[model samples]
Target: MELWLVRHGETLWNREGRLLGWTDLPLTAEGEAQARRLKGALPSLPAFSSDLLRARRTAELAGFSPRLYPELREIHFGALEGALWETLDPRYKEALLRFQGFHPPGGESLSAFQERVFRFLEGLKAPAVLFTHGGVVRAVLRALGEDGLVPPGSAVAVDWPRRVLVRLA
Candidate 1:
């Protein structure tokens, strides 16, 4: 089984270094262009995306009529949604540090987020492509036995750290 996890193109929040956890922001012009480029490079395979518009638009621009899955959505950011990291309240920062291993108030925990993504993957057939968030990609990478996370726009050559069968081509 092979998975092509594609992060949505850059958004306004992304350009501004803001945290858009589950805020449903639209794509920037550059983002749209990037999605077009990605569409041109897509391999024929089953595709899926979160219910959010950004992910949905990315899939549409990528020439994929992807199956929408709410479970594949990014983790809810709670009170921090659509807020810039730099502008986050000090209390929020302190809370995050205090509960470093847990989710924010009204947000989904990291473990829960990863577990949901894993369940989605478990139901999938081999050779599928997933248009999702950076967090989702990271969760998938972790599940595949990779390191911490693969930053957006960078492709991984293998799913598993020491697995021999998996190759990036």
Candidate 2:
């Protein structure tokens, strides 16, 4: 099955380059504009999103009433919810960069997070569209054998359990 994956629109925290896991921030003015621009670009399919407000709002702005999935939510950073990304202990960042073998003091391990993501992917019975977060998108990309970050409001089409198909601008 093909999965069309979209990263949620930017939040104020996103603009500040802060850790935004599970905080449910709303889209910024520019973020709303980006979603408006993004709406017309998605394929018509059964839609899903992370249960977080940002992803839910992104789906709404993007013209899809999506089925929400808690598993689609961003990695929980636990107590570091508002920490600056650049200032985080490099050890945590390095494990995240490698996508394995590290867990934040109060957060989750990358492996455990990836397992949750893969479980959600495995549960899909057909092609679908997903409005999620940066970390979720990154996990999906890595699962599909690619490595790169997608911009907020960007979408990628992947032949699931296989190769990437196309990327939306």
Candidate 3:
């Protein structure tokens, strides 16, 4: 199935460079506007979203009443929640830099997170538009053998578990 994945709009934590995971932060005014801008940016399709407030609001503002999925939620940082990037512990920072097997204290393991997100992807019955988070988009892109960060309110279309076909900024 084709997957159109969208990263939800920005939160205050996002602008502050805080590691925002598992936090139900709301979108800023600019974020809502960004979501509104997505109306013409992505093709209308069946929609899905992480159940978090920001993503739900983004989908709503973007003109899609998406089915919410907990599995699509961003990586949980646990003890690292709301931690600033520049102030992270060396060990945590190192692992994040390499992005391999890095598990923050009290947080989900990379492997486990992948299993959950991929399991959700595998359950999709057809092509869909997903309003989720940056991490989810990154995971899907990496799984499909693509590289790059997906900005907020942007969308990408990829053949599931395969290759990326389009990037809608």
Candidate 4:
């Protein structure tokens, strides 16, 4: 199956270099502009989105009414929900950088997060657009053996359980 994974627009924490997981922040003015730009770029496809306001709003602004799915939400950051990246503990930082052994205080474990994301993806029956978080995108891309960083409001297409296709910014 094919999938288009879209990272939602920028949040205040994104600009501030803070960890953003389950904090439920809205997009910045520039973020909305970024999303609107996607309206003309993405392919017309079945749409789904994280239940978070940021992801849902991005899908709406991009001209789609996506079905909401909590499975698409970012990893629950727990105690690190809004923690500044610059001051994060080295242990947590390394775990995040490597995408391994990360179990944030009162947050989702990396293994569990990956399992949930992949499980949701395995259920997709066809090509679809998923308005989701950076972490969700990362989980998919890294699983496909690519670097997982992408700009807010950007979309990446992939051949599920296979290879990457293209990206739209």
Candidate 5:
């Protein structure tokens, strides 16, 4: 099956370089426009998204009535939510530096996050479009045995919006 995975459009926090873990920020006007543009480029498919408002708004603007998946939400930043890296607690930085394989305080570890994402994907029938976060997309790519994280807004050839099915297999 094919999956069209899309990162949500820009948010205020995104523009400001803030850590937006689990924050429910909505899309900016430009973000909405970007979503609309994406909508125009792809055919309809079953849709799903993280429970965050930014993702939800992106899906709505993109003309997708997605099945909201709480399990698919962005990695929880816990105590670090809504803070910029520069202003974050020093302990947060230390935790991040030492995070090699550890979950931050009040946050899920990278491995844990990937496991949940894969579990969600395993349940899918495929050929589905997932309007989710960059991290989630990365997890999906890794689960599919692909290498490296594709930066946001850059679609991997395997998961390209139009040719997802052919490439995924």
Candidate 6:
């Protein structure tokens, strides 16, 4: 399967370096502009979106009326929803940096989050666009043995369970 995973544009949390999971925030103006820039950059393909407002809005702004899926939501941050990245505990920081042992207090575990995301990808029937979160993109990229950091409103295409194809900003 082929997939294009798009990280939605910047929100307040994104700019603030906060843990942006499950606390639905709209895109900043620059974020909307970023999404608009993607209108012509991405391939026209079957599209899916996270049910969260930011991801949904990004898909819309990018000229897609995508099928929405909660399975595509960012890992629930629980108590850490808006915590600043800088002040985060060393333990949480290490887990996130390592992409392991990251079960946030009252949030989804890393294993469960990976399962949710990969399960959705496994069900895709064809090449498709996924308007989702940074975490979702990171999980897919890391699973494919690529570094997972991408800018807001950027995208990466992949050969699914295999190699990365290209990256678009």
Instruction: Supply candidate 2's per-residue lDDT for 105.
Output: 64
The TM-score of predicted model 5 comes to 0.78
lDDT scores of the candidates, listed in order: 0.70, 0.86, 0.87, 0.92, 0.69, 0.93
Candidates 1 and 3 compared: the better one by lDDT is: 3
Candidate 2 residue pairs that clash: none
Tell me the tens digit of each residue's lDDT in model 1 across 54-161.
888988888898999998898888876776768777766664444336565788887788789888877875667677887776666555555433333323333333
TM-score of each: 0.81, 0.94, 0.95, 0.98, 0.78, 0.98
Report the lDDT tens digits of candidate 4 across residue range 13-96.
Answer: 899999998988999999998899899699889999999999999999999989999999999999999998999999999999
Estimate the overall C-alpha local distance difference test score of candidate 2. Answer: 0.86
User: In model 1, what are the clashing residue pairs, if there are any?
Assistant: none
**Model 5 / residue 129 / CA error / Å:** 0.3
Provide the lowest-lDDT 10-residue window in model 2. Answer: 96-105
Model 1 regions lying over 4 Å from their true place: 87-100, 145-169
Q: Model 3 shows how many backbone clashes?
A: 0
Ranked by lDDT, the better of candidates 1 and 2 is: 2
Model 1 TM: 0.81
lDDT of 6 by residue, 1-169 (tens): 7799999999988888899999999999999999999997999999999999999999999999999999999999899999989999999999999989999999999999999999999899899999999889999888888777799999999998778999987
User: What's the C-alpha lDDT at position 127 in model 4?
Assistant: 91
Evaluate model 6: give its lDDT: 0.93
Q: What is every candidate's alpha-carbon RMSD to the true fold?
A: 3.8, 1.2, 1.1, 0.7, 4.5, 0.7
**Candidate 2 residue spans exceeding 4 A from truth:** none
Runs off by more than 4 Å, candidate 5: 87-102, 143-169
- Can you give the lDDT of residue 114 in candidate 3? 78
- Residue 122, model 6: lDDT of 85
Query: Which lDDT value does model 3 have at 32?
Result: 95
Ranking of predictions according to lDDT: 6, 4, 3, 2, 1, 5
